[PDB]
Coordinates of C-alpha atoms and ligand atoms in Angstrom, one line a residue:
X26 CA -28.1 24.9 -25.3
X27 CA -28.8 22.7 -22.4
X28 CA -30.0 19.7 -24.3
X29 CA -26.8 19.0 -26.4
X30 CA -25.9 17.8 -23.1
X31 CA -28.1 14.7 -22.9
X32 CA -28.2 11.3 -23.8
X33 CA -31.6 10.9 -26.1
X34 CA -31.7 7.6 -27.2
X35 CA -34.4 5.4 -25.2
X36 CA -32.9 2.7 -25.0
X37 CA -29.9 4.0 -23.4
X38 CA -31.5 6.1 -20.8
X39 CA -33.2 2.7 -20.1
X40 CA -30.1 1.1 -19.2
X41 CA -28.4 4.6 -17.3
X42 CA -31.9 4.1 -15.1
X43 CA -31.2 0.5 -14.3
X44 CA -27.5 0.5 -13.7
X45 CA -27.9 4.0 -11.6
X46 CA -31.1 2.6 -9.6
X47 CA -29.8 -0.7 -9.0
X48 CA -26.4 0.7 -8.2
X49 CA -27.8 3.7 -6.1
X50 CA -30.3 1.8 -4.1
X51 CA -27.6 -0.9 -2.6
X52 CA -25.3 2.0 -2.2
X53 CA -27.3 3.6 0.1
X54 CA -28.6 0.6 2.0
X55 CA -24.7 -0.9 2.6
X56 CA -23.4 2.3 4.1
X57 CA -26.5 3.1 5.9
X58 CA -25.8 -0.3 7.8
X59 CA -22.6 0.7 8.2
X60 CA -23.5 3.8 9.8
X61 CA -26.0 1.6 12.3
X62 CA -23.5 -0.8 13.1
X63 CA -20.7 2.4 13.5
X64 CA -23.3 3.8 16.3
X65 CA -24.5 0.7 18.0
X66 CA -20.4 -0.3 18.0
X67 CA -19.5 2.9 20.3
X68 CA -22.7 2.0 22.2
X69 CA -20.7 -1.1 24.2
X70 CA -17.1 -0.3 23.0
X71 CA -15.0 2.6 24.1
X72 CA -11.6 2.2 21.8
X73 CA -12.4 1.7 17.8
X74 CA -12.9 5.1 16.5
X75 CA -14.3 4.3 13.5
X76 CA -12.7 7.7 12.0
X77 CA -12.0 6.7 8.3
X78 CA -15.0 4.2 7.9
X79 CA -17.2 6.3 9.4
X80 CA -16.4 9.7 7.0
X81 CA -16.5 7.4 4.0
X82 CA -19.6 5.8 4.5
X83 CA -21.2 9.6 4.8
X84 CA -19.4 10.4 1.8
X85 CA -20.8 7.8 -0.4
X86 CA -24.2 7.7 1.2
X87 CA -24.4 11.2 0.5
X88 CA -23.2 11.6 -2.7
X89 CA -24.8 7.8 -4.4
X90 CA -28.2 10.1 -3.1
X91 CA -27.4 13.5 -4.8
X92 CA -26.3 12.0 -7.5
X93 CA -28.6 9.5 -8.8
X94 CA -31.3 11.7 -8.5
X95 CA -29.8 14.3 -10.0
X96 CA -28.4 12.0 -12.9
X97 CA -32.0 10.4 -13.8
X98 CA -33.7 13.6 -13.4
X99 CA -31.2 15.3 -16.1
X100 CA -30.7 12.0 -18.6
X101 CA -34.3 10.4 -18.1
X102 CA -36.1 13.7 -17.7
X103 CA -34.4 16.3 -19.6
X104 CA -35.1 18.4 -16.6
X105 CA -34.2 22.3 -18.1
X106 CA -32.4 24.1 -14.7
X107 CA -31.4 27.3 -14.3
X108 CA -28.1 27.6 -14.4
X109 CA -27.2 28.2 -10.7
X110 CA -29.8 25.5 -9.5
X111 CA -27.8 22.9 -11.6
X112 CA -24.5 24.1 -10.1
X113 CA -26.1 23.7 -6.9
X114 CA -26.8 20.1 -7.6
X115 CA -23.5 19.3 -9.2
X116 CA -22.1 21.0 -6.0
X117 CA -23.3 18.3 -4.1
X118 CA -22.4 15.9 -6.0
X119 CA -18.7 17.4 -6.0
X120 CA -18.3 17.7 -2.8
X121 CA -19.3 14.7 -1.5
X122 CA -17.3 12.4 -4.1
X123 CA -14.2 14.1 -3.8
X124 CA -14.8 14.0 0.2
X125 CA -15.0 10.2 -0.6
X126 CA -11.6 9.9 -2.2
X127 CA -10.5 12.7 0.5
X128 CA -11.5 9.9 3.2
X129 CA -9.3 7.2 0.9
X130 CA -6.6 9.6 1.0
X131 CA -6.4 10.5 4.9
X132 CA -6.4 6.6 5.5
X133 CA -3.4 6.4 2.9
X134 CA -1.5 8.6 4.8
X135 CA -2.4 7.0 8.3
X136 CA -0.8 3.4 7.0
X137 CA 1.7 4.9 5.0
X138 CA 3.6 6.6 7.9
X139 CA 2.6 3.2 10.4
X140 CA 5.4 1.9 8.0
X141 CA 7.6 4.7 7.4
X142 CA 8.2 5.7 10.8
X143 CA 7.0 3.3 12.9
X144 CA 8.1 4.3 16.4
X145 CA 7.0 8.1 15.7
X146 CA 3.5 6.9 14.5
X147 CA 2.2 7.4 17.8
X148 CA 2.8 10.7 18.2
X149 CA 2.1 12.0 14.7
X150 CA -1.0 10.4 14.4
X151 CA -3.5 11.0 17.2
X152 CA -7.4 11.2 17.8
X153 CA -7.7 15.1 18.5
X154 CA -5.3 15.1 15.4
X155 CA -7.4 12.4 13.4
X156 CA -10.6 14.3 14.2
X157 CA -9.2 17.8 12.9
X158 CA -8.2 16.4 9.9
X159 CA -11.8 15.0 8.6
X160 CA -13.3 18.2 9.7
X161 CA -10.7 20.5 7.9
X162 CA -10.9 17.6 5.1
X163 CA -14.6 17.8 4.7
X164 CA -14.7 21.7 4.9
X165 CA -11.9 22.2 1.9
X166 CA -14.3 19.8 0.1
X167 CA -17.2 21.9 0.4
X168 CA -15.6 25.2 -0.5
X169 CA -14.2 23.5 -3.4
X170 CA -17.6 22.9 -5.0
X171 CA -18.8 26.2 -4.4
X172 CA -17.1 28.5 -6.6
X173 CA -19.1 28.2 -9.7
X174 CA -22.0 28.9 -7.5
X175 CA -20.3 31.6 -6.6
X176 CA -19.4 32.8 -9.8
X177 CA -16.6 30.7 -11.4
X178 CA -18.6 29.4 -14.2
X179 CA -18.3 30.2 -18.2
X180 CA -21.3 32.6 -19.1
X181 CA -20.2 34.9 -16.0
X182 CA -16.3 34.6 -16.6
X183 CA -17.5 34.8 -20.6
X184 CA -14.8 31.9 -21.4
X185 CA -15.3 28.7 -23.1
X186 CA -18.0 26.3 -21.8
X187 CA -17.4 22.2 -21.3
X188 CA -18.7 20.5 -23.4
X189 CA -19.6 17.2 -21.1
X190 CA -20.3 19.4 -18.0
X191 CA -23.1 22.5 -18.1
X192 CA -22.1 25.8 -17.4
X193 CA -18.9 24.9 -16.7
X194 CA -15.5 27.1 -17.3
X195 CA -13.1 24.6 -18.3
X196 CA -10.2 26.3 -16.0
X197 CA -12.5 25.7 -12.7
X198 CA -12.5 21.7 -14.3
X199 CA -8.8 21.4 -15.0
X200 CA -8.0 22.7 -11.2
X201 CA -11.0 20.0 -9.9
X202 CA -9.1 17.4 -11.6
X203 CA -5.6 18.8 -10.6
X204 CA -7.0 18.4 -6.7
X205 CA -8.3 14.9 -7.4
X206 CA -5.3 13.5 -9.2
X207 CA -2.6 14.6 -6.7
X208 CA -5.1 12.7 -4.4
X209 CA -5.0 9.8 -6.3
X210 CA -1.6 9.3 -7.1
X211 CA -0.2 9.8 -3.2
X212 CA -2.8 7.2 -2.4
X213 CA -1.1 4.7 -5.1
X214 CA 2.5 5.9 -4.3
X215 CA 1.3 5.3 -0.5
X216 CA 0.0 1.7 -1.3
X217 CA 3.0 0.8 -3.9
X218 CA 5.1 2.1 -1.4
X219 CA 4.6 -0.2 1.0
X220 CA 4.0 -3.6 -1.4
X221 CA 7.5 -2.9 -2.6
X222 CA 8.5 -2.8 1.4
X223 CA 6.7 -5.6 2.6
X224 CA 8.1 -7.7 -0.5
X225 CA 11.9 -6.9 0.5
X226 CA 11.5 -7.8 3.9
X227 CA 9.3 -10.5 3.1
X228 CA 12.4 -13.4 2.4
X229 CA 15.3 -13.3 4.6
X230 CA 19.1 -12.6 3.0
X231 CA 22.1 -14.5 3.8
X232 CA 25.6 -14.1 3.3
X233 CA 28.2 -16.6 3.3
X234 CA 31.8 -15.2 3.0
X235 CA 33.9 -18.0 3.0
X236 CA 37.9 -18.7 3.2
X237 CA 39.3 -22.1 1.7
X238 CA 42.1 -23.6 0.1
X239 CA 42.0 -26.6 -1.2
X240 CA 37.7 -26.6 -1.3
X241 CA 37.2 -27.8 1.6
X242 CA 35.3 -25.2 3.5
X243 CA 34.1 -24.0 0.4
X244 CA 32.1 -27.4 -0.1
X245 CA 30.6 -26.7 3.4
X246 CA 29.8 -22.7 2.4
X247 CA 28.3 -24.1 -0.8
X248 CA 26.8 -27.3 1.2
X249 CA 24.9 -25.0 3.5
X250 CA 23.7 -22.4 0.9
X251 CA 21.8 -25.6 -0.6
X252 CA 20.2 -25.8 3.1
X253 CA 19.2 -21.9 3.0
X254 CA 17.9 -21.9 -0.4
X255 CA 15.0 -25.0 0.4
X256 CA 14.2 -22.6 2.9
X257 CA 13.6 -19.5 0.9
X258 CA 16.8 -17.3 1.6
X259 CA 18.2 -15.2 -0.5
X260 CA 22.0 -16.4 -0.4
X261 CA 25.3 -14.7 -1.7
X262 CA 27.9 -17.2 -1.0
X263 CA 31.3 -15.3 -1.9
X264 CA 34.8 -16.2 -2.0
X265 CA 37.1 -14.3 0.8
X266 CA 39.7 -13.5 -1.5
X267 CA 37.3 -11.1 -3.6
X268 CA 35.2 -8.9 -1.5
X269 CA 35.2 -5.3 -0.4
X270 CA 35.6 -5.0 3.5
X271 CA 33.3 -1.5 4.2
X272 CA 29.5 -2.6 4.7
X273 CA 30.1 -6.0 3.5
X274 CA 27.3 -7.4 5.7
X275 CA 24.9 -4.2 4.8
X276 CA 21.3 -5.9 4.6
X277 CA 21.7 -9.1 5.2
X278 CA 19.5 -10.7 8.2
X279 CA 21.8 -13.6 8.8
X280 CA 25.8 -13.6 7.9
X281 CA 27.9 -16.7 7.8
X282 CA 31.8 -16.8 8.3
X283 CA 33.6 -20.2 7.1
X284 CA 37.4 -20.1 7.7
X285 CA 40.0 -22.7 7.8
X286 CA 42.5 -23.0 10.3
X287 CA 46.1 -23.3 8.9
X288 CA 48.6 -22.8 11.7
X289 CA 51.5 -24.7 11.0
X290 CA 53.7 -23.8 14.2
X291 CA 50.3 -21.3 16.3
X292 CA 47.1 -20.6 14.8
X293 CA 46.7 -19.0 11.3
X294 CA 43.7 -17.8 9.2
X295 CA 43.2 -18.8 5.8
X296 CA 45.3 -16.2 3.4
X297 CA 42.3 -15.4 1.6
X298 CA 40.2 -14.5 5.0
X299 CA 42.8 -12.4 6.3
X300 CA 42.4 -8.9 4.9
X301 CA 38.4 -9.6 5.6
X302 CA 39.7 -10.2 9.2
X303 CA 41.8 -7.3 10.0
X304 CA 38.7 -5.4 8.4
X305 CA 35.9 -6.6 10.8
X306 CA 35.2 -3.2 12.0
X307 CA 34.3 -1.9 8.6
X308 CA 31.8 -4.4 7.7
X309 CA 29.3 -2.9 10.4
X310 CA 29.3 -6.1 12.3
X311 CA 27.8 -4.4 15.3
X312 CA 24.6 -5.6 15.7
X313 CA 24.4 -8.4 13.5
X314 CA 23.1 -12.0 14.1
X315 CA 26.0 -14.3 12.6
X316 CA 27.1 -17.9 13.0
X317 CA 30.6 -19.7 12.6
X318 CA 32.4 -22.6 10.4
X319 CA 34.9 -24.2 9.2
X320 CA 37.3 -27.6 8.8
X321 CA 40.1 -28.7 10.1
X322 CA 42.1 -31.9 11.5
X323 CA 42.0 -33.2 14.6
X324 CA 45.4 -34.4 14.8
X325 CA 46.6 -30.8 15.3
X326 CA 46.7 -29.4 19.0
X327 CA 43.8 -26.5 18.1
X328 CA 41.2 -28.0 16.9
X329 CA 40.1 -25.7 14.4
X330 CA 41.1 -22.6 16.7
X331 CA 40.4 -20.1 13.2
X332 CA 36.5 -20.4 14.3
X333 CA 37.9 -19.8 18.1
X334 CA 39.6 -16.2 16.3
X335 CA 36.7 -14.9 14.3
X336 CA 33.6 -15.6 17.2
X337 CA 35.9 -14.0 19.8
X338 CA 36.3 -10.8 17.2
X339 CA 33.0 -10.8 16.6
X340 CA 31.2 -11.0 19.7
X341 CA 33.9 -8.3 20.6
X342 CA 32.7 -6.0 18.2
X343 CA 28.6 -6.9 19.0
X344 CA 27.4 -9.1 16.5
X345 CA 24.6 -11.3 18.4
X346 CA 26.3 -15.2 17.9
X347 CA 23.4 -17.3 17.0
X348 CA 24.6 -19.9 17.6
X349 CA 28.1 -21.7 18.7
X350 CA 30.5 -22.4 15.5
X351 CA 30.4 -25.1 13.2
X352 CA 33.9 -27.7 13.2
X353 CA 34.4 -30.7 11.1
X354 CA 37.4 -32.6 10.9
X355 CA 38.8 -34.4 8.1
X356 CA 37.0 -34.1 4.9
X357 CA 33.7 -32.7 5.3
X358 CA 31.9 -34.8 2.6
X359 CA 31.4 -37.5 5.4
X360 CA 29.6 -35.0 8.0
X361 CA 27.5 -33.9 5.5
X362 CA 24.7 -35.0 7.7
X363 CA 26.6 -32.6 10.9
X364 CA 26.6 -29.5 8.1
X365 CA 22.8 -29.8 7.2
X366 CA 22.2 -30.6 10.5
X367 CA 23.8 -27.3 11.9
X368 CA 22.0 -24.9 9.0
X369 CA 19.0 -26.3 10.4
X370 CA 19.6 -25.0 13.8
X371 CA 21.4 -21.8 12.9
X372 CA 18.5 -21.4 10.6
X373 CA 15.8 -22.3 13.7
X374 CA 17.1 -19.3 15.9
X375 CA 16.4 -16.7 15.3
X376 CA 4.9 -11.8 4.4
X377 CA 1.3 -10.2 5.3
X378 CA 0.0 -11.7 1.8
X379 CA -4.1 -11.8 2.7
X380 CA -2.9 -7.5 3.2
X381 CA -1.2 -7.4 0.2
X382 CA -4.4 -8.8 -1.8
X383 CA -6.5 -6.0 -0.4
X384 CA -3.8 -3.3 -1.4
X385 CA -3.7 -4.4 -4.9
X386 CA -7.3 -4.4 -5.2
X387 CA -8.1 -0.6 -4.1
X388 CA -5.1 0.0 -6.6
X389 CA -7.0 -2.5 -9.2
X390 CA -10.8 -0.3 -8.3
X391 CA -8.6 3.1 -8.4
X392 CA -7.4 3.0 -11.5
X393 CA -10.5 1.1 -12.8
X394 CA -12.9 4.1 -11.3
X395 CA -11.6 7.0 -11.6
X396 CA -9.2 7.0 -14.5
X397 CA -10.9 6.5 -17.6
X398 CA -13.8 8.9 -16.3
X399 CA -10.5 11.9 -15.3
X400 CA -9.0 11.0 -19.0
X401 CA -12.5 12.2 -20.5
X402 CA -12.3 15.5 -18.6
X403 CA -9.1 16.2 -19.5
X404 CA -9.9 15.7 -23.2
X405 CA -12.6 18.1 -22.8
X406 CA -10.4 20.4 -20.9
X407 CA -7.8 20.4 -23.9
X408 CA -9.8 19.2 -27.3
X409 CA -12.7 19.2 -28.8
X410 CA -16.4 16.4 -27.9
X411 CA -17.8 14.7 -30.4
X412 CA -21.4 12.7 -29.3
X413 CA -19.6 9.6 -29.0
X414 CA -17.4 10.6 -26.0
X415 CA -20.3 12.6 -24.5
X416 CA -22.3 9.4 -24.5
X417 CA -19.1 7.6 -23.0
X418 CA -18.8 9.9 -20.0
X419 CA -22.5 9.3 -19.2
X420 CA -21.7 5.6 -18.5
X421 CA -18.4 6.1 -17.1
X422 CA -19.8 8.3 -14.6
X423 CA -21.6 5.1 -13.6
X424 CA -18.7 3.6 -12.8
X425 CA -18.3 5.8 -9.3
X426 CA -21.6 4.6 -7.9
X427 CA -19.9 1.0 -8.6
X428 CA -17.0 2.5 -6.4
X429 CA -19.2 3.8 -3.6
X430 CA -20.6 0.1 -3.6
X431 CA -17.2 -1.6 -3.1
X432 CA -15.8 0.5 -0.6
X433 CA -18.1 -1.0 2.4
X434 CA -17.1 -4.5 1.2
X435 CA -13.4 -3.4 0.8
X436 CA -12.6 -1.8 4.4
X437 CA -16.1 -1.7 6.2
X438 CA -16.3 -5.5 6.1
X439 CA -12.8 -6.1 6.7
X440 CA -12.8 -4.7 10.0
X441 CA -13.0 -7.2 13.0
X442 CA -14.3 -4.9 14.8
X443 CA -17.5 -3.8 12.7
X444 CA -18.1 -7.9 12.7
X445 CA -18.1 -8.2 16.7
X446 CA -20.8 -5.0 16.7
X447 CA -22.7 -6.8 13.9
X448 CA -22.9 -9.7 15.5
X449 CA -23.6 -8.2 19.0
X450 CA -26.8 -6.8 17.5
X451 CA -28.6 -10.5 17.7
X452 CA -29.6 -12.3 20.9
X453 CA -27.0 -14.5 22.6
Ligands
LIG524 C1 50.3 -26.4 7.7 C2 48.9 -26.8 8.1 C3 48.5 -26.4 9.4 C4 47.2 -26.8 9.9 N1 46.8 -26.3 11.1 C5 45.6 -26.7 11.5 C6 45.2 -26.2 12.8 O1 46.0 -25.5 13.4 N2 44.0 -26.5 13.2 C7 43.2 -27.3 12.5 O2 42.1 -27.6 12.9 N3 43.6 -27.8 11.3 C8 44.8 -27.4 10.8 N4 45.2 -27.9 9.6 C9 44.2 -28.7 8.9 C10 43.4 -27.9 7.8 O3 42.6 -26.9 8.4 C11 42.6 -28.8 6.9 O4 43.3 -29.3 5.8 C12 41.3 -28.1 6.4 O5 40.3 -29.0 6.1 C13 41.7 -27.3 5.1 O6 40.4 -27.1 4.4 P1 40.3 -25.9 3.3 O7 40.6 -26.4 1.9 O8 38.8 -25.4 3.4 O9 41.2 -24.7 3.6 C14 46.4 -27.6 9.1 C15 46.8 -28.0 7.8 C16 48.1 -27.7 7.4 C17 48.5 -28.2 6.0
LIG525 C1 -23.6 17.5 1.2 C2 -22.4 18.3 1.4 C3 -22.2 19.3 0.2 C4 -22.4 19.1 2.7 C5 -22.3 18.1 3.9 C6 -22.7 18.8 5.2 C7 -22.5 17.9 6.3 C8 -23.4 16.6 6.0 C9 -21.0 17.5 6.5 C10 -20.2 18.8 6.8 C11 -19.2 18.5 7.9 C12 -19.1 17.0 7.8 C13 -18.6 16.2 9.1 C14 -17.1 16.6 9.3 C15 -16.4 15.7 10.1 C16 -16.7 14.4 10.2 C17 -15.7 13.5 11.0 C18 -15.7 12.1 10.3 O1 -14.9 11.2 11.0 C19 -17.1 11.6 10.3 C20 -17.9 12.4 9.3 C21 -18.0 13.9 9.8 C22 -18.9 13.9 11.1 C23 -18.7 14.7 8.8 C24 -20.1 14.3 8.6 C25 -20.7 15.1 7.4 C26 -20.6 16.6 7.7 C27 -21.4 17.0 8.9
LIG526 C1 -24.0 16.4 -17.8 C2 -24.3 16.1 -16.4 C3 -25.5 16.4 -15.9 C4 -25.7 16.1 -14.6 C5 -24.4 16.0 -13.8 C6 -23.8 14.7 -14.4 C7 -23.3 15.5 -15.6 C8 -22.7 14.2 -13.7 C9 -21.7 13.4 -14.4 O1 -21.9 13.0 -15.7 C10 -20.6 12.9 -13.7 C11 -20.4 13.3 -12.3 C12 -19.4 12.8 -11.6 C13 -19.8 11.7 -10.7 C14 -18.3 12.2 -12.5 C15 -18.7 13.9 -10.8 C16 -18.1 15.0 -11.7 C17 -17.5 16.1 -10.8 C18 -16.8 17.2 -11.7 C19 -16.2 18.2 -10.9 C20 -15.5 19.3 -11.7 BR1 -16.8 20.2 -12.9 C21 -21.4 14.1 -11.8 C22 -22.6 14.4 -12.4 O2 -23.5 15.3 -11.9 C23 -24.8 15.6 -12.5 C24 -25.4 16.8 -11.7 C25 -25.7 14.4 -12.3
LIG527 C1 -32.2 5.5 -3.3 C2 -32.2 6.0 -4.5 C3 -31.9 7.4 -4.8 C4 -33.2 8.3 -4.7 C5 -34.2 7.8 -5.8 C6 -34.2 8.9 -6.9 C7 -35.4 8.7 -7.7 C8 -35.4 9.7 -8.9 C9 -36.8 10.2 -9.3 C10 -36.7 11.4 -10.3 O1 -35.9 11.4 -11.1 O2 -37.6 12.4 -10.1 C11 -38.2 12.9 -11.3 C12 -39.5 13.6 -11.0 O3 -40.4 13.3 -12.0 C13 -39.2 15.1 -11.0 O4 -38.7 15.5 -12.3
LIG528 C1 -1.1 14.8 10.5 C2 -1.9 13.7 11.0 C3 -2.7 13.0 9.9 C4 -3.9 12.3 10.5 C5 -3.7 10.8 10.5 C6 -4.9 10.1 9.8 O1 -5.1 10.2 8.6 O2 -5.9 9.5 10.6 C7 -6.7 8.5 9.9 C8 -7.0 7.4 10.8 O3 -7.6 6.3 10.0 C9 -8.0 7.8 11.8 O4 -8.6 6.7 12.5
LIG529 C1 -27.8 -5.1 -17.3 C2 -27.6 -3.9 -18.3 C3 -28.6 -3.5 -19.0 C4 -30.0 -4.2 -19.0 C5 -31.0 -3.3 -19.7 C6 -31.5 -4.0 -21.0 C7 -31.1 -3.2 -22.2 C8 -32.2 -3.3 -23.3 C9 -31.6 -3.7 -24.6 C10 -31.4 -2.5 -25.5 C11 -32.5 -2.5 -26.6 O1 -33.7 -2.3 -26.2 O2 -32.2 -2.7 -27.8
LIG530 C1 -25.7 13.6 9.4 C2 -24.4 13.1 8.8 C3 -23.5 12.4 9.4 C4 -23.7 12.1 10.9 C5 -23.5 10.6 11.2 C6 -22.2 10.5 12.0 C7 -21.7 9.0 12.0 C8 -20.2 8.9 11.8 C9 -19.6 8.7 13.2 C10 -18.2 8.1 13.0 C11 -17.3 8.4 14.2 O1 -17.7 8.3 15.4 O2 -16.1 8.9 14.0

């Protein structure tokens, strides 16, 4: 019975025909422009492909169309199809949305391997490979949304019908979801992914092993962390005498070494920096920008010569010297001013937040979009639809056409290119 299947109440197919109209109708004027500023773009400009904005702007143009039409004929006019005419228009409308998150999904994996492997990006991802892609992307999409045409539907397979969807088997729905949802959650693992990278490389770490006896070069590690930490580092000051040797300066942009110099008759280390020293090699030094301190006395022939020990060690074993090493005589309470002076220009040699905004946001319209509307399905798929749900599903299916809206404002206007083409368009 087709017409279990429709919302009845007037003055809810009032408001289904003004938030699908409305929505619909700016829809397809937004990506329409964007497909006339796409072609006028490669009219004067050979290099921005236009791959990913260009496929999701035919995806939602498309499918706003099929849709909306389809969705006030059915709900407003209790149009009575045969079955396999109304396949044929939910096969459009099938195809072309999950093209659109298909589009989302390519894009995902474009930026997600830019971070993960950098270097290799430019081989992986190509134009001849790009265009393949969209076209093999676009087909599977298609074929997709022609099996129940084709005879995957419930009164042929004689199986239990949907109750939100006509004609529907509900084994053909639980796979269109499965496809969808995999989709889906790459595209938030891709995007997650990369906030939780961008956030760990976002502040700088430094690490402060330091070797004193009687607090002297202590007061200067813990008088230079105070420097660091006004200007956002993440600092681990530890004592010498409690630290484990092998990969001791793993992670850390910036590693400080403070040592004393306690040579009574030649030059010593301090006791508690001397089975750090004899370690150097296991604390991957190689590589590794670090800097120099410590006190001592002037009175004594080497002026603190510990300092002289450790930076000769170090940029033995490769660690880039930032900068020349840090010596205070006496007490170093009175050069405070030479201390904070130095972490300044240790700290001078040497976040992306407006793209972490946009990332949260797709995430935000994601999981707004399309995850109350999946959780319907799935009910139907599994239990049993009373008319409230039905009635639900009718409006949360509105809530894609709202999605087809925000994607030109999310990416489409966001690209400076696509603003230089827009612009070009006037006289000037
Ligand atoms: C036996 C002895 C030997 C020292 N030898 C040196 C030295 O060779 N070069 C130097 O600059 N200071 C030397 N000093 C001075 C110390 O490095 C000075 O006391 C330093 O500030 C100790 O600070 P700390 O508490 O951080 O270890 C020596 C001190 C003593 C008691
Ligand atoms: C309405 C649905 C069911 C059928 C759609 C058929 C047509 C419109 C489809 C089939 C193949 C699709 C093309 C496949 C490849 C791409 C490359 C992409 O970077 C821009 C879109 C573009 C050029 C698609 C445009 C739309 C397209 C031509
Ligand atoms: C009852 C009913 C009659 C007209 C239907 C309408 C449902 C409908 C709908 O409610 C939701 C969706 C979407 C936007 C949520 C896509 C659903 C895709 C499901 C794929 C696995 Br079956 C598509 C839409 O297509 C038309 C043809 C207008
Ligand atoms: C742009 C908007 C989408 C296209 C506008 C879709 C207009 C829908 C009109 C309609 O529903 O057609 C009913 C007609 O009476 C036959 O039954
Ligand atoms: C395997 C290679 C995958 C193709 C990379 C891709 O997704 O290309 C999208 C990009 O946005 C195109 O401009
Ligand atoms: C904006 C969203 C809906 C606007 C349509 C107005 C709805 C009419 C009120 C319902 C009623 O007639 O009782
Ligand atoms: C007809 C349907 C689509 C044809 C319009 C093609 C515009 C997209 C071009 C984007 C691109 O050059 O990659």
């Amino acid at each position: 019975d087709i017409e279990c299947f429709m919302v009845l109440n007037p003055s809810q197919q009032l408001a289904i025909a003004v938030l699908s109209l409305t929505l619909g109708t700016f829809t397809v004027l937004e990506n329409l422009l964007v497909l006339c500023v796409i072609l006028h773009s490669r009219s004067l400009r050979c290099r921005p492909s236009y791959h990913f904005i260009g496929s999701l702007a035919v995806a939602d143009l498309l499918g706003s169309v099929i849709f909306v039409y389809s969705f006030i004929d059915f709900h407003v006019f209790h149009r009575k199809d045969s079955r396999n005419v109304f396949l044929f228009k939910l096969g459009g409308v099938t195809a072309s949305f999950t093209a659109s998150v298909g589009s989302l999904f390519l894009a995902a994996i474009d930026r997600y391997i830019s971070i993960h492997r950098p270097l290799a990006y430019k081989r992986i991802v190509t134009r001849p490979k790009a265009v393949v892609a969209f076209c093999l992307m676009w087909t599977i999409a298609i074929v997709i949304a022609v099996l129940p045409l084709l005879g995957w539907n419930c009164e042929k397979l004689q199986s239990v019908c949907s109750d939100i969807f006509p004609h529907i088997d509900k084994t053909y729905l639980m796979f269109w979801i499965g496809v969808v949802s995999v989709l889906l959650l790459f595209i938030v693992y891709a995007y997650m992914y990369i906030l939780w990278k961008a956030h760990s490389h976002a502040v700088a770490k430094a690490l402060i092993v330091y070797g004193s006896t009687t607090g002297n070069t202590e007061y200067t590690a813990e008088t230079i962390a105070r420097e660091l930490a006004d200007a956002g580092y993440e600092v681990d000051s530890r004592d010498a005498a409690s630290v484990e040797a092998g990969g001791l300066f793993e992670g850390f942009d910036l590693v400080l070494l403070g040592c004393s110099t306690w040579g009574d008759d030649s030059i010593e280390l301090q006791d508690d920096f001397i089975p750090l020293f004899d370690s150097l090699e296991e604390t991957g030094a190689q590589g590794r920008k670090v800097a120099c301190f410590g006190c001592g006395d002037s009175s004594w022939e080497y002026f603190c010569g510990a300092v002289d020990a450790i930076e000769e060690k170090l940029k033995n074993l490769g660690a880039e010297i930032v900068q020349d090493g840090l010596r205070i005589d006496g007490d170093p309470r009175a050069a405070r001013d030479d201390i904070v002076g130095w972490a300044h220009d240790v700290r001078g040699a040497i976040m992306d937040i407006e793209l972490a905004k946009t990332l949260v946001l797709i995430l935000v319209v994601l999981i707004i979009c399309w995850g109350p509307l999946l959780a319907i399905m799935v009910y139907d798929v599994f239990g049993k639809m009373n008319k409230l749900i039905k009635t639900v599903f009718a409006f949360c299916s509105m809530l894609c056409l709202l999605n087809s809206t925000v994607n030109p404002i999310i990416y489409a206007l966001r690209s400076k290119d696509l603003r230089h083409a827009f612009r070009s368009m006037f006289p000037s």
